[PDB]
C-alpha cells in the first residue's frame, strides 16, 4: 500500500519527526544499550499519551497508548516490526508493516500480513527484507509464548529489560 | 516449483507423492483431527517414516527412522499446507513453509524465501499466502508455551498425536 514509514528520534532537541514530517516535541528519552524509550503527548483522536520502546536487535518497537476515558483498546503491548537503529544522538525507525498485539498471560496476534505480502509483491520492500520481517516476528512470538505470553518477561529474560510509567 | 500436492489413498493403501510416485503404506488410522501414515521409505538418510495430517491446523507432524550410519535426534518437521479430508482419499497443497522442532529446545521456521518467490510469481495467492504464515505462527506459538514440545502442544488443545515406538 504505503512504503515503509520511517520516523526520526532526535535526542538533541527532543523531537521526533513521524511518518508525515510532522515534528513532535517529546517529553523525555531514555536510552540503554540494548532500546530507546521515549514518552510524549499526542493529539490523536484515541489516545493522549505514546510511550515506546525501540529495541534494534530485535527489530521491534514496543508501544503502549494511553487511550481516552471508554476508548481502552484490549492489549496490553503493541509491537511494530521493522528495523530500527541506534545514532548517538538520533535513532531512527523503519515500519515492516507487520504488528504484534499482546494480551499479557494470554495471547499474541499477527496482524497485517497481507499488508506486507503486497508491499513485497509491488517491490516497496526486497525479499530479503520482507523475509527478516516474518523472522523478526516469529523469534517475538517465540519468544512472548515461552513467557506466558508476557513481553517484558521475555524480554527482561534476555538482558533488554523494558519498563513503563505505568 | 509450483505448490506440492499428495494423495493419501486408504483404499489402496498408497501414498502418492508430489511426483505421482506412489509408495505403499503399512499403516493409515483415521482420527477426527488427522491421518496417521506409517511406510517405508528409499531416502538415502531414512528407511522408514511416521506422519500426521492435521487439517484443522494445515500442519503435517513427521519424524524418520534413519539408517545405522546416519542417525539423528528425532526432531518433528512440520510441513504447512492445505490438507484436505476425503472418505477414501485425502491431500495435501505444500505452502514451502516448514518448522524444525528440536524438542524442549528451540523450532526454526524455514522457507519462508519459497514462500514470497511463490506469492510473488503467482503460484499462490495472498490470502493462502497469508494463511500459510498464520499457520507457521500458530503452530510457534503453541510449540513455544508447551515447553517447546509439538505433542504436548497438539495434546493440550484436544489433537493428540501418537507415534508407534
Known amino acids: ?5 520511517v520516523e526520526y528520534f532526535d535526542l538533541r532537541d527532543h523531537t521526533n519527526t513521524d511518518p508525515k514530517g510532522f515534528v513532535r516535541h517529546v517529553d523525555h528519552y531514555r536510552v540503554e544499550p540494548w532500546g530507546l524509550y521515549m514518552a510524549r503527548t499526542s493529539d490523536h483522536p484515541q489516545f493522549h499519551y505514546l510511550e515506546s520502546w525501540l529495541l534494534p536487535d530485535l527489530g521491534l518497537r514496543a508501544s503502549i497508548f494511553h487511550y481516552h476515558p471508554y476508548h481502552q483498546r484490549d492489549q496490553d503491548h503493541y509491537v511494530d516490526i521493522g528495523t530500527f537503529t541506534r545514532g548517538d544522538d538520533v535513532w531512527k525507525s523503519e515500519d515492516h508493516y507487520l504488528d504484534l498485539v499482546v494480551r499479557t498471560g494470554r495471547d499474541t496476534e499477527l496482524l497485517d500480513v497481507d499488508e506486507l505480502m503486497e508491499a513485497h509483491t509491488t517491490g516497496l520492500l526486497d525479499t530479503a527484507t520482507a523475509e ?4 523478526t516476528a516469529t523469534t517475538a512470538i517465540d519468544g512472548i509464548a515461552a513467557h506466558g505470553h508476557d513481553l517484558g518477561r521475555w524480554l527482561a529474560s534476555i538482558g533488554m529489560p523494558i519498563d513503563w510509567r505505568g
Open 1 to 5: 500500500i504505503h512504503p515503509p514509514k
Open 132 to 135: 527478516q520481517a516474518i523472522l
